Design a protein around this ligand. Structure first.
Ligand SMILES: O=C1C[C@@H](C(=O)Nc2cncc3ccccc23)c2cc(Cl)ccc2N1
Ligand SMILES: O=C1C[C@@H](C(=O)Nc2cncc3ccccc23)c2cc(Cl)ccc2N1
Ligand SMILES: [Cl-]
Ligand SMILES: [Cl-]
Ligand SMILES: [Cl-]
Lengths: 305, 301
């Protein structure tokens, strides 16, 4: 019993975190095989950030300008190239702790674990979701750039996020490990704002199934709904549309609890229109949307890595 | 910016997790140097669990009755002893991945990270707190026994909890790494129940200071309170008493935000009276109590 916001064990990623220093800027790098990946803005001064020409800034750098520190050992940089908003520093040594890995780009609503790092040293691990507006509500301070987001599928780490910046609202923006930003953001010190956020509907439904699995049924009702009527209601409350794919994905949870997906949608509709009336669900007074259907099944079945 | 429930990176603990089997029972063990620590109830059958005499059950065991698996390698048990509710299995190999570590017994309100494990394999990491009633609101299934709670300070792992059981309300009970239970619990299937749980007041105040540090002031008011009037009001909402120790502990956060502790206590009294009126504090519609003053300072600017 119990249901917690749970991150993947971070050990496989911790063995990859390094410190990258270029001039006065110090941030985190991800050392996999003989390449260190880090945000390309490590080459910028605070003035350069206003309007950077990364190709021009990078062409002026030599391999020795990048100091890469792995624990208390200096890695020698033997090459450097840029791929989108990520800088790839070729090093002479393959990371002996390199896990089986892949670079994957995730979709909004998908969750991942963040290993927050400062000076190449892991400080904490937390779970979060890629919001529908492509930001992450992370917890990051200055020096956290280059911290990564990941999932573990069997013994393979899928790196999906690299931290680049904080927007004025305190939410965060970053890229996949190929340097493509999630969202309409650019790596420049300029006026940028996240779009209006929405709630991840399929994830709320998954969390309602987790509450039922854990013994909370007060919100269940005798009613069902159509997918079209539910989406009309859900659109009114800034909830993401629920697709037939989402309904299919919730199939196993529906079969385990005996509550059809459109039956759970009727519970959700009532919760949106009437609130919780002083009650909580899994210790929360708000509908939680940062657990996917897969996360719920994984936690309520004890999958290991 | 931002404020998340954040666990310590679990790598240093993952390299210590092993599977311990005694007959038909399989649970997790913590392998540090040449000793594997695990709940003593690994020697019990489901029958034994009502009134087990652990000394009597253990005396009938030999070293070769305990199967310890570290990854895909079987460790050889060369000795066994019981210390309180923990079984210590001496093995013939020191764990090469043993971090710098310590065993610490924590007090209610303290937080720690849990590395939930099944069959010696880590499944997930989460953050929790030792409740005032000495239970933890964990997320654990059958086979999770032996999973540990820890904190990391500098490069040293302070092990503070080992999971032993689930109470009928779905909350969890366990021991420190010396095998002493937290709370009035016993490692028996006898009818046991947690005492009425209360909110960790000092932690709620710390989290209100975190909200102020992160730019949220809507809940502040022009009032102050005496510590005794605060406690009289707080107890009515099942909040733990706030001691002068707690007030002292909140000193640094009070100095950083410019809000005196008793001034923040008056905001808390008002929040308990009014609720949040559709507002949130750090993305939460409830008052959060699983962040200590130490956690807030570590995480916040
Ligand atoms: O001031 C900056 C630095 C950097 C950035 O956002 N870094 C941070 C990242 N995360 C949490 C932070 C908290 C507090 C201060 C900085 C933080 C940056 C990177 C880029 Cl790509 C564009 C602009 C900027 N502006
Ligand atoms: O049924 C039991 C087994 C064990 C225990 O609680 N195990 C678990 C531990 N954690 C989460 C569980 C979830 C679901 C089922 C079991 C769980 C135990 C240990 C002891 Cl010391 C005393 C009594 C028991 N009774
Ligand atoms: Cl609601
Ligand atoms: Cl599924
Ligand atoms: Cl303590």
């Amino acid at each position: 019993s119990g249901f917690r916001k749970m991150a993947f064990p971070s050990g496989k990623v911790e063995g990859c975190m390094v410190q990258v220093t270029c001039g006065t800027t110090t941030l985190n790098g991800l050392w996999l095989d003989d390449v260190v990946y880090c945000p390309r803005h490590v080459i910028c001064t605070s003035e350069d950030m206003l309007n950077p020409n990364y190709e021009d800034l990078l062409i002026r750098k030599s391999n020795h300008n990048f100091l890469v520190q792995a624990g208390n050992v200096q890695l020698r940089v033997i090459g450097h190239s840029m791929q989108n908003c990520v800088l790839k520093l070729k090093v002479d040594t393959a990371n002996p702790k390199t896990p089986k890995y892949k670079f994957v780009r995730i979709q909004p609503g998908q969750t991942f674990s963040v290993l927050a790092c400062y000076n190449g040293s892991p400080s904490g691990v937390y779970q979060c979701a890629m919001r529908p507006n492509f930001t992450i509500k992370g917890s990051f301070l200055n020096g956290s750039c280059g911290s990564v987001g990941f999932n573990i599928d069997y013994d393979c780490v899928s790196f999906c996020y690299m931290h680049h910046m904080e927007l004025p609202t305190g939410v965060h923006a970053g890229t996949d490990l190929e340097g493509n930003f999630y969202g309409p953001f650019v790596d420049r010190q300029t006026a940028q704002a996240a779009g209006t956020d929405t709630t991840i509907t399929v994830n709320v439904l998954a969390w309602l199934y987790a509450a039922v699995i854990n013994g909370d049924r007060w919100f269940l009702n005798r009613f069902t709904t159509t997918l079209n009527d539910f989406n009309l209601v859900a659109m009114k409350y800034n909830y993401e549309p629920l697709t037939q794919d989402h309904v299919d994905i919730l199939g196993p949870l529906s079969a385990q609890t005996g509550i059809a997906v459109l039956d759970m949608c009727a519970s959700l509709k009532e919760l949106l229109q009437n609130g919780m009336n002083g009650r909580t669900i899994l210790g929360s007074a708000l509908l939680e949307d940062e657990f996917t259907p897969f996360d719920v099944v994984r936690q309520c079945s004890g999958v290991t890595f």
